[PDB]
Write a protein that binds this ligand. Structure first.
Ligand SMILES: [Mg+2]
Ligand SMILES: [Mg+2]
Ligand SMILES: [Mg+2]
Ligand SMILES: [Mg+2]
Ligand SMILES: [Mg+2]
Ligand SMILES: [Mg+2]
Ligand SMILES: [Mg+2]
Ligand SMILES: [Mg+2]
Ligand SMILES: [Mg+2]
Ligand SMILES: [Mg+2]
Ligand SMILES: [Mg+2]
Ligand SMILES: [Mg+2]
Ligand SMILES: [Mg+2]
Ligand SMILES: [Mg+2]
Ligand SMILES: [Mg+2]
Ligand SMILES: [Mg+2]
Ligand SMILES: [Mg+2]
Ligand SMILES: [Mg+2]
Ligand SMILES: [Mg+2]
Ligand SMILES: [Mg+2]
Ligand SMILES: [Mg+2]
Ligand SMILES: [Mg+2]
Ligand SMILES: [Mg+2]
Ligand SMILES: [Mg+2]
Ligand SMILES: [Mg+2]
Ligand SMILES: [Mg+2]
Ligand SMILES: [Mg+2]
Ligand SMILES: [Mg+2]
Ligand SMILES: [Mg+2]
Ligand SMILES: [Mg+2]
Ligand SMILES: [Mg+2]
Ligand SMILES: [Mg+2]
Ligand SMILES: [Mg+2]
Ligand SMILES: [Mg+2]
Ligand SMILES: [Mg+2]
Ligand SMILES: [Mg+2]
Ligand SMILES: [Mg+2]
Ligand SMILES: [Mg+2]
Ligand SMILES: [Mg+2]
Ligand SMILES: [Mg+2]
Ligand SMILES: [Mg+2]
Ligand SMILES: [Mg+2]
Ligand SMILES: [Mg+2]
Ligand SMILES: [Mg+2]
Ligand SMILES: [Mg+2]
Ligand SMILES: [Mg+2]
Ligand SMILES: [Mg+2]
Ligand SMILES: [Mg+2]
Ligand SMILES: [Mg+2]
Ligand SMILES: [Mg+2]
Ligand SMILES: [Mg+2]
Ligand SMILES: [Mg+2]
Ligand SMILES: [Mg+2]
Ligand SMILES: [Mg+2]
Ligand SMILES: [Mg+2]
Ligand SMILES: [Mg+2]
Ligand SMILES: [Mg+2]
Ligand SMILES: [Mg+2]
Ligand SMILES: [Mg+2]
Ligand SMILES: [Mg+2]
Ligand SMILES: [Mg+2]
Ligand SMILES: [Mg+2]
Ligand SMILES: [Mg+2]
Ligand SMILES: [Mg+2]
Ligand SMILES: [Mg+2]
Ligand SMILES: [Mg+2]
Ligand SMILES: [Mg+2]
Ligand SMILES: [Mg+2]
Ligand SMILES: [Mg+2]
Ligand SMILES: [Mg+2]
Ligand SMILES: [Mg+2]
Ligand SMILES: [Mg+2]
Ligand SMILES: [Mg+2]
Ligand SMILES: [Mg+2]
Ligand SMILES: [Mg+2]
Ligand SMILES: [Mg+2]
Ligand SMILES: [Mg+2]
Ligand SMILES: [Mg+2]
Ligand SMILES: [Mg+2]
Lengths: 118, 59, 150
RNA sequence: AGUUACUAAGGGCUUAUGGUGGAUGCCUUGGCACUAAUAGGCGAUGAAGGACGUGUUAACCUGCGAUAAGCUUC
RNA sequence: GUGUAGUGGCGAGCGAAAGCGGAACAGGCCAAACUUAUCAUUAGAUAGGGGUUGUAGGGCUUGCAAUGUGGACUUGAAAACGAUAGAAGAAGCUGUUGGAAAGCAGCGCGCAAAAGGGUGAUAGCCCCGUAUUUGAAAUUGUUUUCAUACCUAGCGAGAUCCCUGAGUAGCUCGGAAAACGUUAUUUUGAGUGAAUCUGCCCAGACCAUUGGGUAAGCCUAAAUACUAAUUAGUGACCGAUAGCGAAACAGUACCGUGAGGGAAAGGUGAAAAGAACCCAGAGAUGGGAGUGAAAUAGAUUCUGAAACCAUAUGCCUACAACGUGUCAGAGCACAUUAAUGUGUGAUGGCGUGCGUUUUGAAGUAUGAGCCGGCGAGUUAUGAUAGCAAGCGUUAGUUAACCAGGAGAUGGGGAGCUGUAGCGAAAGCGAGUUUUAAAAGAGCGUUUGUUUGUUAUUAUAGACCCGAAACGGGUUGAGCUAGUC
RNA sequence: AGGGGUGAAAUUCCAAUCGAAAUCCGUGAUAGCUGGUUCUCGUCGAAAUAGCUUUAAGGCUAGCGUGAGAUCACAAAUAAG
RNA sequence: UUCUCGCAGUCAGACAGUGGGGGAUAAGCUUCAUUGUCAAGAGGGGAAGAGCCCAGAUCAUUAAAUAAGGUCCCCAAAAUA
RNA sequence: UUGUGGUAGACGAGCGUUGUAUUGGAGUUGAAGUCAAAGCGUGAGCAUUGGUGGAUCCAAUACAAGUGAGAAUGCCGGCA
RNA sequence: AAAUCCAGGUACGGGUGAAGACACCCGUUAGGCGCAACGGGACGGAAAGACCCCGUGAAGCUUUACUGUAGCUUAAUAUUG
RNA sequence: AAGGGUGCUUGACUGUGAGACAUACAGGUCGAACAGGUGAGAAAUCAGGUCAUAGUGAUCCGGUGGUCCAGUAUGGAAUGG
């Protein structure tokens, strides 16, 4: 019983080739280089999911910090005032407010500024 | 498989599968051993657990 | 069960076959369980049984047993044991009676020996070449008898 | 003074097509391993194996042997 | 029987002979005595009769009973069963898609034939065949019957006489065969050398008793070993890198002085109907025409993958430090296995391959130019363990072999494991070994077997590839060295 | 004519090969040494130590892993005395 | 982590702290004892680093609080005295 | 509720190829092969449509393996 | 045509790192692509280091290494009086 | 005191041995207690070599002494146990 390989190797090889579509030259043509690039690209994608979670937080912090410095308050004290006033809002939504709704963002800063903590 | 001719003539089996054996240092040079040592080595013994597996497949 | 749906009892037919060459996903790829670059990982095999790497093996270290009856064979005996003979159903136990019951082969001339201590209730009449003193005591403590063939 | 598109000698990516190439699939006057029988030899009455030659027919192959792609008889 | 008794630098290892169960079965014939005839009968030689042994046989002398049964046997005659060519051999139309029906559907039919092959697709009824019934002038095989040669025959008595295989059996010195590493048995290179049924040999040195058998002469069917070839057939065998090296004109082309080494290469279409003719061209050829269902089936001839080379719609790219990707992200261009869609990616953040072997490899260590195919844990016989099934407490299970489809299986109980252990052993026995001991201590005072599957292991080449080598046979002095 | 030949002698020559030709066979020699060993997922997960070894790039046993079973407390861990 | 059975792999280790031997209070040296990491372990700090510090990655989330470390710009985050 | 880094290694559960045995089914109104696409799965993997192709193939339950290729300065063919 | 070739879009300085970097960290420089040159580097290419060590590897040679043996020599015995 | 002297002696015993130490194995070390028959001592008690730790070599093979075992048909013997 001589089992002969055909359509088994080609199908699993073409899967890797399909994933590595859009690469530079041989990196999409040859199966070997395509397989290596897909594995490396998967590693990159894994690492950058974690790094995206951190980098977007940093960008929100930067935007929020800038928006406060125009009013004379700093980021380090703005978050402290937020905690003492029990207000719980993401820096993402707060930055979205300062870019989309300047008046309502200014309302939040006014209350945290001076109103009695709790 | 053939039973080793040296494994036999030196290892006898028992009811529960223990492999009986004879103590060594009982061939010559008697004055270099004490009578306590000689009378303790006269009695027979069994292979230890470290060798039981190696002798089971040898027999 | 039909021929188009036939099934074995669970955990009786199929067991995990350890394939040693088909990929690392099975945990048995590349090296295939031999280890790494040593004697046990080559095609030769696992040396010799009983070997100890040059140190004198255990059998070569221990004295040889002695055979007093050199070149002889122990005389085999057919032994009737008292603890189990009660379970067997027969009276006047002689050589001929054992043949129909097929305890002894009709093409065998081995001498019959009586052995045992367990008390028996009904009496039996043995025809034995040899009998123990206390086995005879037990048999004759009941209403049985024993004759010693010569 | 300031912010600015078009360029593609050439190249990159996607898709479609053409060409070189004979992988995969289907098949086979071919191989392999055996079963049941037969048989277990040919040769000085010239053997096995070859050379040469033979056509109404280029060569090759096959058949045949100056009775030469065949002769006689049943 | 058993990997048992044994044999082994007692190491690696090697390993019977009895017995038991089966296949088949068959026993015959010479020498010597004694006698006949002939050889200058110095025969011690030739040709005949007689004899073939062991619970001894035969010869010598003397009687009874015998005319048969059986052969491994010669010629013939007759018959039967075959082999080498063959003869006969049943059963269907209509409609639909289609180039084409045998497919599909409707209504039928035959079968001791529903094995197979071909016929424009997939046919029990289209054809050839197959089942079944048959047939040989000639050659040849087996068996049977009849006759005919050759061989083949019992039980006594007395005599007390003769014959029974010689450089032979033994023995010594060196080897060997048997499982044995030489030793009772077998054999022999050298030397020596017996006896004659009250005899000789054997039963593991050797002697005696007992018992077994007749060496130094020959022939012997059957069961057993193998398949280059002939006929029929089969395959959980291969299907052009596979299967024989060889599907083709393969041991060919080709390599070498020679022995020797040794490839690749199959498929048009149902049918060549193989493209008349026109145009360009020198022509091959190409574009039309024509045949065809299909010509992108056109002889480059089934299908036609990737690497590789070119063309083009769309996006991006000439201040730009790049394992070439990833996460965000404008603009541009489209519209899908309708999906928070797809193609490209100005720009921002992060980012030193894959296997190998190493304490540690981005590696200035190693392996791969790319693509496709092939390429490395198997089989046979045993052991142990896990899991599961069958049968069970005088259990369990067969091996060879026979019948049966190259079957499941039935017969076959030879044997194997367990049922009682201890001891070196005789031996004893729920006990036994040690010992003066019963005390003490060691071992025991119970939990089976046959299969299936998996894992490991032993013998085999044993997961695959790789040495420099060693031994045996042949081919080479047309180059070169010497000599003639 | 190859555990041979030849050598005004160098290990020269013996068919572009000679510390002992070429070829076939034993043969699939052996290699404790390199290289390679092909699908997936889940649970757990080491060692580079001791002794012996004509042993040091290898092997055996112990130590460390894993699967199954038993031991519930008298076993083993973490703190205080 | 104790006992019994089946199957292993491992016998080339490296560095950091601590106590020493050899060296010269030299070695990224060599040989031990002990605590850890790497081997077989990514992430954050150390500018870049196998072994140092903080810790232990099941997958997705453009959610929040923290450890070592840090807050002029590169690069997230500070002010007073 | 306690967990889910992982090499050597141990254990368990599955995918895929070829063929055989039982059932059913598709196919010149177009099977295998083969190419493309904006699908489905935890993974081996599995579908749908269209082009090419011209005759076999599929599903389920079991069984047997020449059963899984990226590396061996691997062999062969082709092409850079 | 040729050896070569993991895929490449292939700068320099200091540092780092398996201890001598086109690719890592920090800076500097550099429009895209050829042609003719010359060899600095790519521890450049060709040869699984010939030196060294390891293997209970091979082969050649040597000797009062071991075990054997052709040949030579001596004696007994047979041919042998 | 385990050092010195004296008297009597030979326990520098036979068969064993619960339980432990240390160990991969093989081996090593300590030992209560029992039976037999002794030595010293009035007796209790002590004695299975020395104040303790080095003074030693497996298996195979063959030899020696004893022996309540075997003795290849039987009785011996050979040869073994
Ligand atoms: Mg393949
Ligand atoms: Mg693993
Ligand atoms: Mg293993
Ligand atoms: Mg190693
Ligand atoms: Mg390796
Ligand atoms: Mg190993
Ligand atoms: Mg040694
Ligand atoms: Mg252009
Ligand atoms: Mg382009
Ligand atoms: Mg006819
Ligand atoms: Mg007909
Ligand atoms: Mg038909
Ligand atoms: Mg004799
Ligand atoms: Mg021999
Ligand atoms: Mg006689
Ligand atoms: Mg005898
Ligand atoms: Mg005779
Ligand atoms: Mg071929
Ligand atoms: Mg081909
Ligand atoms: Mg030629
Ligand atoms: Mg045309
Ligand atoms: Mg072509
Ligand atoms: Mg074609
Ligand atoms: Mg620009
Ligand atoms: Mg600039
Ligand atoms: Mg830079
Ligand atoms: Mg960049
Ligand atoms: Mg980027
Ligand atoms: Mg980079
Ligand atoms: Mg791999
Ligand atoms: Mg290295
Ligand atoms: Mg190194
Ligand atoms: Mg580099
Ligand atoms: Mg190098
Ligand atoms: Mg290397
Ligand atoms: Mg390379
Ligand atoms: Mg390849
Ligand atoms: Mg089993
Ligand atoms: Mg049977
Ligand atoms: Mg007792
Ligand atoms: Mg059972
Ligand atoms: Mg000449
Ligand atoms: Mg030689
Ligand atoms: Mg020289
Ligand atoms: Mg030459
Ligand atoms: Mg090989
Ligand atoms: Mg070797
Ligand atoms: Mg874990
Ligand atoms: Mg460690
Ligand atoms: Mg350690
Ligand atoms: Mg080694
Ligand atoms: Mg171990
Ligand atoms: Mg260390
Ligand atoms: Mg060390
Ligand atoms: Mg240190
Ligand atoms: Mg120091
Ligand atoms: Mg130090
Ligand atoms: Mg160091
Ligand atoms: Mg390692
Ligand atoms: Mg880390
Ligand atoms: Mg860092
Ligand atoms: Mg975790
Ligand atoms: Mg915070
Ligand atoms: Mg802090
Ligand atoms: Mg900042
Ligand atoms: Mg895990
Ligand atoms: Mg199938
Ligand atoms: Mg299709
Ligand atoms: Mg394969
Ligand atoms: Mg080229
Ligand atoms: Mg440095
Ligand atoms: Mg090398
Ligand atoms: Mg050597
Ligand atoms: Mg050798
Ligand atoms: Mg002489
Ligand atoms: Mg005194
Ligand atoms: Mg004293
Ligand atoms: Mg010896
Ligand atoms: Mg005798």
């Amino acid at each position: 019983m001589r089992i002969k390989g055909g359509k088994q190797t080609r199908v699993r090889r073409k899967k890797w080739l399909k994933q590595a579509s859009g690469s530079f030259g041989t990196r999409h043509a040859s199966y070997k280089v395509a397989k290596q690039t897909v594995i490396q690209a998967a590693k990159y994608a894994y690492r950058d999911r974690r790094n995206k979670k951190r980098d977007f937080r940093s960008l929100w912090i930067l935007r929020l910090n800038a928006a406060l410095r125009e009013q004379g308050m700093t980021y380090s004290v703005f978050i402290n005032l937020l905690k003492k006033h029990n207000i719980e809002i993401n820096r993402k939504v707060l930055s979205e407010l300062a870019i989309k709704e300047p008046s309502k963002f200014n309302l939040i800063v006014q209350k945290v500024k001076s109103e009695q903590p709790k | 498989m053939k039973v080793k001719s040296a494994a036999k003539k030196r290892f006898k089996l028992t009811k529960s599968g223990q492999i009986k054996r004879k103590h060594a240092y009982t061939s010559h040079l008697a004055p270099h051993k004490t009578t306590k040592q000689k009378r303790h080595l006269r009695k027979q013994g069994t292979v230890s657990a470290s060798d039981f597996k190696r002798i089971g497949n040898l027999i | 069960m039909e021929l188009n749906q036939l099934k074995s009892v669970p955990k009786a037919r199929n067991h995990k076959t350890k394939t040693l060459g088909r990929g690392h996903g099975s945990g048995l790829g590349k090296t295939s369980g031999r280890g790494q670059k040593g004697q046990k990982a080559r095609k030769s095999g696992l040396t010799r049984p009983g070997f100890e790497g040059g140190q004198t093996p255990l059998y070569r270290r221990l004295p040889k047993f002695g055979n007093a009856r050199k070149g002889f064979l122990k005389q085999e005996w057919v032994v009737l044991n008292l603890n189990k003979i009660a379970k067997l159903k027969l009276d006047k136990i002689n050589r001929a009676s054992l043949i129909e019951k097929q305890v002894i082969s009709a093409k065998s001339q081995l001498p019959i020996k009586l052995i045992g201590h367990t008390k028996l209730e009904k009496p039996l009449h043995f025809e034995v070449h040899k009998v123990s003193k206390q086995a005879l005591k037990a048999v004759e403590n009941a209403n049985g008898s024993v004759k010693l063939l010569e």
